[PDB]
Design a protein around this ligand. Structure first.
Ligand code: ATP
Ligand code: ADP
Ligand code: ADP
Ligand code: MG
Ligand code: ZN
Ligand code: ZN
Ligand code: ZN
Lengths: 338, 97, 592, 502
DNA sequence: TTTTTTT
DNA sequence: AAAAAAAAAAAAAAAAAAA
């Protein structure tokens, strides 16, 4: 709200008032002469149409790791944004914000303490989005001449394989398989609506100290949709949406059965023999572009799971074995292996 | 004051017990111990409450039991040999015999 | 504004009597809707007028009223309803049904469907079109309309109208004989109320391309729109926007600087053929085509398809009191290596069946604590909801152990009881079971008997009605045909007609067996008894069990269930016995 | 002001109470069924009349039946006044002043929970559902007597509402009701009260939508007539209840979204908003799911049939043939089951030692021969029978168990299957599979005919007066004729001596 | 069958 | 007039699992 307009059952002029504080009180009796009379000429009510409003939003920012002094915990800062600049920034990006550093009264808490202590906030004025733009390969003259140069380059795939992770020596065919994973397989269905997916499921297997995790990190860096997971450390990785019990009002916002950006994502997993039965059930359910339809409270908004699976696992002995491999295996179901 | 449930051997199977409050005046203090089955003779009385009327929307009243006599009935369920608050107590002629 | 009261009503009435959808047809470049529909309403007794905007836009004078309607929805709609109220008499010239019924309109297709991610405050008090998924609901909330009062000293009663919720209470009773000011007391239970329901709506996932989270917009409905939607629905709505001050501290007069956003909707949309059956039902080869019509993409595997179809048809259920009811459901198990697309069959049958729940190895009733509210509700599991239909189970080997007993409880009595938290009751299931399981290892060894590879207890697998085994072995020919079929598909089928036919057979048709079939049944039983023994003293296992007789009785009844017959024939029993013995013929272990 | 409509409906109501004069049979020329009900009250001191809606249906047609049914709340006190008039006309001493009640039954239709709408508020209605929770029987104030302190000026027969109300004036002219009023407990009249919760049955609910829940308020003689898990049909008047917290009280004062259809502008409310919610009030509840004492139940058939079958001379000969006609063969098993149903005499010594007086039977056989049929038949016939499997997924096992919510004191016990079977005949199926702890509990429990488990700082003694009937299976599929029961069955030696027959 | 460990 | 509660740590009983 910026200006609040009332109406008093045909009192000529209709009273206007303005409020800048985050709280206010309404009017009850108007000052018109017919109501300056001992009794009111019709009771007044708040009018929504005549009043003025502005778009409002609230965001908070966190310090970068590089700027945190050793042995310290990063702090936060709130930002209030108004006007057309609303919706000019999204979570998870580096920005350079210029604004006005204003105080905020503590009386909203209504604790009667902190006689001199008050909170602080920032009001945005001009935002530089910074970071990088994906642009969805939008065509332009420069990218057209770039692809012309690529065509003139002749043979491409070998150079692309060589250029992924020069830090890790050798392993050419793994990089070739990575190339073939990045493009995707046959897709867009067949006759009679039968389901086929272009996603490719490739599992990396080998001894510790082979830098398969580092190659996986390089692939995650080089891909835009890549998501990296590993053995334990948190419980929100799967089976629960990121908005579980998130709002300050605790609205139980959720989708039900879903994973992390599983729609056209690249699920990179390390220590594929480490996770519990719940994550294993989830990854059996994400099979062959099958959606995730796990319900807990009547929710059935399934997530359209269509992702390529790339996971690295280590042998339970930590080394290869002279005896048969399928019995040694990875302690994984044969159905999942197939 | 103490909380009195129903005897688990008395409640119908698969049901839930009903709690009551018992107030013990002078000379009855600490006669009862936690976890034991007891039988109490008392007076039933009612009193007004605010939150009880708040949570129900009807003029409901609370009730407490003012204890007047307490008899222990743990283990020894054979309750027909003799009467009295304590069956392990003796008179003087019983001591003489 | 005060412009549309006079001329817009008359113009709309004129085009009510003057509209012909031929104008819209010309606009299409590939008839008096209002009067014919209004007389239809007159002869129906209904009270509803759907109203599209495009055909409303088709006329040049009406678009002015169109724009005025977007700006001022409430007043325009009210005056349109009054116009229809007068059009009642203007057209009938019984007038008795008219005075009793109200009139309302349902505008729709007013504009482009927006999303919750772009809602600027410029769109306040404006009509919008929204699509989304209904998440939750709320109990109907009474709304105050007519306040009742009673002058308690003099028992005098007065009825008071209200406006904008706030009541102007009478400061004194009208009876000047008492004329007391303080004798005004209201009666809660003698008033009149309106039914209000609040719905929570989620944006469609189409509006979130980059893995963000959807949002929620509150909804409000009145009267005929109450309970018109429930959880999981996909609907589209058309209604105006609204904003409200939030109370903040309920003990204080202050109000917060922000307002809650919610919408009020007025219209919601979602997202004798029995002769044809007999013409189809009269054909001789209905059985084979009907069986092959439910799995178009599955190559060969005809016998299992026939068995599954007969299971879908079901047997007969009877409740004679002298000996208690008899189970009429068929249960079939699937086993084999995971190279057969066997989950596809369950997926087919789940959507083909009228009622059914598809799950995998919690399945039954268990009391839960409510999440959004703090209360206790009794919740029923998947098996309870599959009453009369087919319950499909996958990964049956990974069944844990506690749940298995529950199945042993339900397959032998079709009734489940619960004794928890002071609740003791019994629930009916009466459902069919279809399950698939995998062997242990990279392959199923034919020499190895079935029992160990399927790691189920002998009683549970013995008490299934039938069982089927799939064994993929490498051959040049069969692999050639499979590869050709798969390539051709990669490179005669009915419609929901199937569902209605199944229902009609299920509940209209009650076939019974005849005296002639008894002789064939007993002869078959004696025969397999003899086939289960030999002249030698090996003491052969008794392979002809009473379960076989019950199974064949149910299967013969099922064969008469299809083709809409009323009494079984011999062909039914020969088909049933051949089907029941084909699986047994491949049930043997490495010996013999 | 006089509501002449109420007077007219009261007159018609008392009139058809007076002279309904319906005949039930040919021998019953004129019966005056309601006079007979009043006679029953005279001879038994009862309080509540029961009125069939169909008998009320044809009386003055819709001029009376619909008038009473629709505005039931409006005309209830008029019906009460007419009832008092007639009863004191015919039975004055019966009033020795007391709260008569009226329960209507046999309504032409029943409504589902999802069909409840506000337009039927104040109208008689019938609903059905499953009760999932009850509340303790608490008393409530009905008619109060207040004293105006300094001058007592007894203000009696003060009515109440959802809020604890007080008198507003002092009839003493010298007094001016300035002194605050004080309630007289011994002069007030209380009534019973119990709140229950219901929910839709599984058949009505479409899809996986969550059930709709409603609250039902009982009063009078209908207390404790419903138990959790019982599907019951109620009859009563639909009402609406406000939030008393916003209303003035001597005490001190999904959901965050608000948007409640409130109302304000009143004197007592002040700056507060009053909300409403739906509740049901009930008046009638039904559920849809010594030898001299027995002889006192006299009837012609009761006399003749029993006299004949006692004076008969092949009773036993026929009797065993009359048990479980569905099963074929197994003649001795039927006699055994009959003896099990008959039971044995229970005697207790003069030392407080209990002697077992029941029979326990085990049945063994090769698979798929009729053995489950006997258990199913006896469960379907014998009263207070419980059917269960040897292996149970419940935490209660067979005997009992203790259950707690986390950080919840006293570890409230849960009744086991055997505990439910107590005070009645039990049935066990698939007996060979058993829990070892439950097995060592039961074999000492059968002799003691009781089980006592003490765990987690709580202890109790339970009653398990049960007759056990169990079925087992020979090890190896089929009974090997060479060996014996000990060789064929793996079940332990001491339990075999617990059973009395095989 | 027994003791251990996890829920 | 009201801060009241999610996050931890520690103590059991039941069931299932391995030897
Ligand atoms: N081919 C290689 N070229 C360069 N560095 C390599 C190569 N193989 C291994 N390394 C070195 O080994 C380390 C990475 O191996 P690392 O053990 O982290 O990977 P991993 O095989 O996925 O196993 P783990 O699960 O133990 O991390 C780095 O220090 C890296 O320099
Ligand atoms: N006869 C067949 N026709 C078409 N596809 C098949 C056939 N047999 C196997 N497949 C393919 O192989 C897979 C077999 O999986 P399935 O046996 O259902 O595994 P599980 O039952 O263990 O989930 C299917 O997903 C299917 O795509
Ligand atoms: N009148 C009868 N005579 C003999 N057997 C019967 C009769 N009625 C039913 N049966 C069979 O006896 C069986 C009883 O179940 P049960 O013997 O417990 O089988 P299982 O031992 O496999 O659990 C039923 O499966 C039924 O086929
Ligand atoms: Mg690694
Ligand atoms: Zn005014
Ligand atoms: Zn008056
Ligand atoms: Zn006084």
């Amino acid at each position: 709200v910026e200006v609040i307009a009332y109406t008093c059952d045909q009192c000529g002029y209709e009273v206007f008032q303005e409020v800048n504080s985050r709280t206010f009180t309404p009017l009850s009796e108007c000052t018109s002469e017919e109501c300056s009379q001992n009794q009111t000429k019709g009771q007044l009510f708040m009018s929504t149409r005549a009043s003025k409003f502005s778009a409002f939003q609230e965001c908070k920012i966190q310090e970068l790791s590089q700027q945190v002094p050793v042995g310290h915990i990063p702090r936060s800062l709130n930002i209030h944004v108004n006007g057309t600049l609303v919706r000019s920034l999204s979570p998870g990006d580096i920005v350079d914000v210029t604004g006005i550093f204003l105080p905020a009264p503590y009386t909203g808490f209504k604790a009667l303490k902190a006689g001199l202590l008050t909170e602080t906030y920032l009001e945005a004025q001009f935002v530089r989005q910074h970071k990088k733009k994906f642009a969805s390969f939008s065509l332009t003259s420069d990218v057209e001449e770039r692809v012309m140069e690529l065509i003139t380059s002749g043979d491409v795939y070998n150079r692309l394989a060589k250029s992924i992770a020069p830090e890790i020596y050798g392993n050419l065919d793994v990089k070739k398989a990575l190339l073939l994973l990045l493009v995707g397989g046959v897709d867009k269905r067949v006759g009679d609506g039968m389901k086929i997916r272009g996603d490719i499921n490739v599992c990396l297997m080998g001894d510790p100290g082979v830098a398969k995790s580092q190659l996986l990190k390089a692939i995650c860096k080089i891909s835009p949709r890549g998501v990296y997971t590993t053995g334990k450390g948190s419980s929100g990785v799967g089976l629960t949406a990121a908005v579980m019990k998130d709002p300050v009002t605790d609205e139980m916002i959720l989708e039900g059965g879903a994973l992390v950006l599983a729609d056209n994502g690249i699920c990179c997993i390390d220590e594929f023999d480490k996770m519990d039965e719940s994550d294993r059930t989830a990854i059996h359910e994400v099979m062959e572009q099958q959606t995730i339809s796990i319900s807990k409270a009547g929710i059935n908004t399934t997530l359209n799971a269509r992702t390529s699976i790339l996971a690295a696992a280590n042998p339970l002995y930590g080394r290869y074995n002279p005896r048969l491999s399928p019995l040694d295996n990875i302690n994984l179901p044969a159905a999942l292996l197939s | 004051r103490v909380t009195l449930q129903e005897a688990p051997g008395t409640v119908p199977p698969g049901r839930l017990p009903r709690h009551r409050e018992v107030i013990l005046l002078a000379d009855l203090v600490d006669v009862s111990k936690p976890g034991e089955e007891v039988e109490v003779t008392g007076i039933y009385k009612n009193n007004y409450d605010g939150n009880l009327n708040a949570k129900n929307g009807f003029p409901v009243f609370a009730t407490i039991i003012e204890a007047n006599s307490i008899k222990r009935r743990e283990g020894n369920t054979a309750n027909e040999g003799e009467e009295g608050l304590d069956v392990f107590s003796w008179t003087e002629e019983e001591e003489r015999e | 504004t005060n412009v549309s009261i006079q001329e817009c009503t008359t113009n709309f009435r004129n085009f009510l009597m003057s509209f012909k959808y031929k104008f819209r047809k010309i606009l299409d470049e590939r008839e008096l809707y209002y009067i014919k529909q209004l007389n239809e309403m007159r002869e129906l007794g209904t009270s509803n007028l759907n109203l599209d905007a495009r055909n409303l836009l088709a006329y040049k004078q009406t678009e002015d009223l169109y724009h005025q309607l977007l700006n001022y929805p409430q007043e325009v709609i009210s005056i349109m309803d009054q116009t229809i109220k007068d059009c009642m008499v203007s057209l009938i010239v019984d007038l008795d049904e008219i005075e009793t019924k109200f009139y309302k309109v349902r505008p729709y297709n007013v504009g482009s469907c927006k999303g919750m991610r772009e809602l600027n405050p410029n769109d306040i008090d404006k009509l919008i079109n929204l699509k989304g998924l209904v998440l939750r609901s709320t109990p109907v909330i009474p709304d105050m309309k007519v306040a009742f009062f009673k002058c308690n000293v003099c028992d005098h009663t007065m009825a008071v109208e209200i406006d904008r919720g706030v009541i102007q209470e009478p400061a004194r009773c009208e009876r000047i004989d008492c004329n007391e000011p303080n004798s005004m007391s209201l009666i809660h239970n003698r008033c009149s109320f309106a039914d209000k329901q609040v719905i929570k709506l989620q944006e469609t996932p189409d509006f979130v391309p980059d893995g963000q989270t959807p949002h929620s917009i509150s909804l409000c409905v009145y009267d005929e729109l109450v309970d018109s939607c429930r959880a999981g629905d996909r609907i589209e709505v058309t209604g105006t926007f609204r904003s409200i001050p939030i109370r903040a501290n309920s003990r204080q007069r202050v109000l917060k600087s922000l307002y809650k956003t919610y919408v009020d909707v007025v219209h919601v949309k979602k997202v004798q053929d029995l002769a044809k059956i007999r013409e189809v039902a009269a054909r001789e080869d209905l059985y084979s085509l009907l069986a092959r019509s439910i799995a178009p993409s599955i190559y060969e595997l005809e016998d299992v398809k026939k068995g599954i179809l007969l299971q879908l048809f079901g047997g007969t259920n009877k409740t004679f009191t002298k000996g208690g009811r008899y189970r009429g459901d068929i249960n079939i198990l699937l086993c084999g290596d995971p190279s057969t697309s066997k989950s596809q069959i369950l997926q087919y049958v789940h959507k083909i069946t009228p009622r059914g729940v598809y799950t995998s190895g919690g399945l039954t009733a268990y009391i839960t604590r409510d999440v959004d509210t703090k209360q206790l509700v009794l919740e029923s599991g998947a098996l309870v909801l599959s009453d009369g239909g087919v319950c499909c189970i996958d990964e049956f080997d990974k069944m844990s152990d506690s749940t298995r007993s529950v199945l042993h409880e339900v397959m032998e009595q079709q009734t489940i009881s619960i004794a928890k938290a002071g609740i003791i009751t019994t629930l009916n299931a009466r459902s069919s079971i279809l399950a698939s399981a995998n062997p242990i290892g990279s392959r199923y060894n034919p020499n190895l008997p079935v029992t160990e590879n399927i790691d189920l207890p002998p009683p549970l697998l013995s008490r299934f009605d039938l069982v089927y085994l799939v064994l993929d072995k490498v051959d040049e020919k069969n692999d050639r045909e499979l590869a050709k079929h798969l390539t051709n598909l990669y490179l005669v089928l009915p419609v929901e007609f199937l569902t209605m036919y199944i229902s009609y057979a299920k509940e209209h048709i009650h076939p019974i067996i005849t005296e002639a079939a008894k002789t064939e049944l007993v002869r078959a039983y004696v025969g397999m008894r003899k086939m289960g023994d030999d002249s030698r003293s090996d003491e052969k296992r008794i392979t002809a069990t009473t379960r076989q007789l019950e199974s064949m009785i149910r299967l013969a009844e099922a064969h008469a269930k299809m083709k809409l017959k009323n009494v079984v024939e011999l062909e039914d029993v020969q088909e049933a016995v051949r089907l029941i013995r084909s699986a047994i013929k491949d049930y043997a272990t490495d010996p013999k | 002001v006089d509501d002449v409509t109420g007077e007219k409906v009261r007159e018609a109501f008392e009139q058809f109470l007076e002279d309904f004069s319906v005949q039930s049979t040919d021998t019953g020329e004129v019966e005056k069924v309601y006079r007979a009900q009043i006679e029953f009250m005279k001879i038994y001191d009862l309080n509540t009349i029961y009125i069939d809606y169909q008998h009320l249906s044809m009386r003055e047609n819709g001029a009376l039946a619909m008038a009473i049914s629709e505005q039931y709340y409006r005309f209830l006190p008029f019906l009460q006044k007419g009832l008092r008039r007639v009863v004191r006309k015919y039975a004055p001493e019966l009033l020795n002043e007391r709260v008569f009640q009226i329960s209507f039954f046999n309504l032409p239709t029943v409504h589902r929970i999802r069909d409840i709408r506000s337009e039927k508020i104040g109208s008689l209605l019938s609903i059905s559902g499953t009760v999932t929770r009850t509340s303790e029987v608490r008393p409530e104030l009905y008619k109060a007597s207040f004293t105006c302190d300094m001058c007592r000026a007894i203000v009696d027969n003060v009515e109440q509402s959802f809020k604890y109300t007080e008198p507003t004036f002092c009839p003493n002219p010298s007094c001016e009701n300035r002194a605050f009023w004080t309630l007289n407990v011994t002069r007030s009249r209380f009534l019973d009260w119990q709140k229950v919760r219901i929910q839709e049955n599984a058949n009505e609910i479409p899809t996986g939508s969550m059930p709709r829940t409603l609250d039902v308020i009982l009063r009078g003689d209908s207390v404790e007539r419903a138990k959790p898990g019982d599907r019951c049909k109620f009859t009563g008047v639909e009402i609406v209840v406000p939030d008393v917290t916003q209303l003035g009280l001597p005490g001190v004062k999904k959901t965050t979204e608000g948007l409640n259809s409130g109302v304000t502008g009143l004197r007592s409310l002040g700056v507060r908003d009053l909300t409403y919610k739906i509740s049901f009030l009930a008046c009638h509840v039904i559920s849809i799911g010594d030898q001299e004492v027995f002889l006192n139940s006299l009837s012609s058939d009761e006399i003749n049939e029993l006299k004949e079958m006692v004076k008969d001379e092949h009773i036993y000969d026929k009797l065993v043939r009359s048990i479980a006609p569905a099963v074929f063969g197994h003649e001795a098993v039927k006699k055994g089951i009959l003896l099990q149903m008959l039971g044995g005499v229970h005697k207790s010594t003069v030392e407080g030692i209990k002697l077992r007086g029941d029979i326990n039977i085990c049945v063994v056989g090769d698979p798929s021969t009729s053995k489950s049929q006997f258990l199913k038949y006896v469960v379907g016939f014998a009263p207070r029978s419980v059917y269960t499997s040897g292996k149970a997924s419940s935490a209660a096992g067979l005997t009992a168990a203790v259950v707690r919510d986390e950080e919840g004191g006293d570890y409230t016990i849960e009744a086991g299957a055997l505990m439910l079977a107590d005070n009645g005949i039990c049935c066990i199926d698939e007996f060979d599979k058993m829990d070892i702890s439950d097995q060592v509990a039961i074999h000492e429990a059968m002799e003691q005919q009781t089980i006592s488990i003490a765990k987690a700082g709580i202890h109790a003694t339970l009653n398990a007066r049960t007759s056990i009937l169990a079925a087992a299976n020979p090890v190896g599929g089929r009974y090997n004729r060479k060996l014996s029961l000990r060789g064929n069955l793996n079940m332990t030696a001491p339990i075999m001596s617990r059973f009395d027959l095989f």
